[PDB]
Symmetry: C11
């Protein structure tokens, strides 16, 4: 099952898990300080992940960068 | 299951999930502001995804770019 | 399960689902205006997809372009 | 399942599905006008596909061109 | 399931399905005229295919040409 | 399931299927004349394939030629 | 199932497992001192992993580095 | 299941199937005359294959030759 | 059919520590390696994370990495 | 569907030995190859390790290796 | 299921199978003399393998050498 890597490029990056299912809203927000890395899967409860704030992101389709 | 990466290139971008099944309609519109990235799967409930607004998009088939009205 | 990426290159492009099953008829026509992108799977309900109008198309077999 | 991409290079191209099963006959003929693109799977009902008319075709095996 | 692509390079090319099972015989022969393409799967009923007549053939193993 | 492509390079080529199972014998021989191509899977009934006569063969492991 | 490799580049690096399921919380924090290596899977109990502290990280998407505190 | 290609480079080559199971013995020898090709799978009944005589052999791990 | 890691000890007394799979996380075994020995160790029903202490050359599917003592 | 090894005897009296799968490990069969004969042998429900003695050219999915008598 | 290739570079190389399960101990040691090769799988009974002595080793992750 797929995962994304998120490296925070500043304090307070917000990695937001959206609920899997007929309804969509966020069910968890994990904040990262600058330099921290989160490696997070798609799961039974999370089917979309949003990143807010400056982050360096890797997925199976390559590198992408969120800007705050 | 496959996923698409969408990075908003201006405020107010909408990533719209279309319902899976005989019926086709919008069930959710996720609004993205400039700089934010959404990584969204295809799912039991979403079998097509539409992107309105300027965005940089990656899928397994490569990069594509949506342009806004 | 695979999908196809369609970027509309002018207004009023139609992405048409054809029904899976013994019967083949339309079922849904999604209208894309210029610059909009639709990323659409093959599904229990859709086993063929037609594009009408000018669009840039990506599949697992490469790029192809429809013309209006 | 595998799918084929067909781009009509002239009007009245026919993409014809042959029935899966002991019997082989045409169950459906999809007419493409010049410039239209059909992306069509193999399915429970369709185990062979025939293209009549000038078209550009992609399959997992690469490009091939049908001629009028 | 695998498929073979056949482009007829002359009229009257025959793509012949051989029966799956203890018995081997021809259950169908599809006639292609010049420039027609047939994309044909292996199936529950067809476990070998024979091409007779001049054609350009693609499979997973690459290109081969039959001659009349 | 995998397949073999055989192109006959002369008349009279035989593509012979061998029975799956505890016992091994020929259950079918398909004759190919010059230029005809057969594409043949391994199956419930055929676990080995013999080619006799001159033909160009392709498999997943590349090209080989019978004489 | 996928795994990540983490090599601590200073003392006191934490490798933190987040719970799988509807509830998300830390359920374990593995402390690495400098030069130690942990190779950790995703599991029935861990669906996300956070690294805090200076570390060299390998995943199937390649090399990433966490930067300390 | 994997398969092996054996092309006999002299008459009398033997392709020998060894029994699957706790017992190991030869259950069949297929004799190949010069220039014959045999394409043979691993099966419920055959878990090792021995070749005797001069032959050009292909497997998933590349070319090897046997010599008489 | 799980993944495995290759650990070659570059000095005596390297420890390859298996961590328990499941809701709880603890060391269930430390295999001690002397210099020049190679351990090839899978992830398993009982081991979902592996810690290496001491100097070792390591290979996994994501490449080479080295632990330091 | 299992993996297999190709063994080409480079001298007479080469032995390809099958070791039993399961809690008990012993030799259950030894196949004698004379010079230039080839054996293509799978791992099986009965054979979970294969030992080659004598001079032979071996191909696995990991590449070529050679045994020396 | 994965396997390791071990080529003894001196006499008395010991290939040691460790028990799968909650407990860890060795359940078999297979000694190799110089120039013998052992191709050993991971199994229902062996989930870790230790090599002692000078040996050339291939795994899916490449070559490694043990030093005795
Ligand atoms: N609840 C939605 C979340 C989602 C996933 N991908 C999407 C694409 C667009 C809009 C919403 C979504 C679902 O599981 O389907
Ligand atoms: N409800 C439709 C959504 C869809 C997916 N792919 C499409 C292609 C064309 C039109 C509609 C669709 C379905 O699941 O089939
Ligand atoms: N209803 C048809 C749709 C179809 C898919 N592929 C085709 C190719 C040709 C003609 C029709 C089709 C089916 O499910 O089989
Ligand atoms: N009814 C046939 C259609 C077919 C598929 N591949 C073929 C090859 C040759 C002739 C017929 C076919 C079948 O399902 O098997
Ligand atoms: N009825 C045969 C057809 C066949 C497939 N491949 C073959 C190779 C040789 C001879 C016959 C065949 C079968 O299903 O097995
Ligand atoms: N009846 C044998 C045929 C066979 C397959 N592969 C072989 C290799 C060698 C000799 C015989 C065979 C079987 O199914 O096993
Ligand atoms: N007992 C934990 C061990 C573990 C695996 N990967 C981890 C990542 C971080 C922290 C703990 C772990 C589990 O099976 O899930
Ligand atoms: N409990 C959450 C943990 C998680 C995984 N991926 C995430 C992405 C964003 C936020 C939370 C998560 C889950 O298993 O789904
Ligand atoms: N009995 C242990 C053996 C093992 C596998 N990999 C390990 C890593 C470290 C320590 C022990 C092991 C198990 O099956 O899990
Ligand atoms: N009867 C043995 C045959 C065998 C397969 N591979 C081997 C390797 C060595 C010795 C014997 C064999 C088995 O099925 O397991
Ligand atoms: N009977 C043992 C044989 C074995 C396979 N791989 C090994 C590695 C080392 C020692 C023994 C083995 C097993 O099935 O597990």
């Amino acid at each position: 099952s797929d995962f994304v890597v998120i490296k925070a490029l500043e304090d307070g990056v917000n990695v937001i898990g959206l609920t899997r299912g007929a309804d969509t809203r966020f069910h968890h927000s994990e904040k990262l300080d600058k330099g921290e890395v989160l490696i997070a899967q798609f799961t039974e409860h999370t089917s979309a992940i949003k990143v807010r704030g400056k982050a360096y992101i890797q997925t199976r389709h390559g590198v992408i960068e969120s800007e705050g």
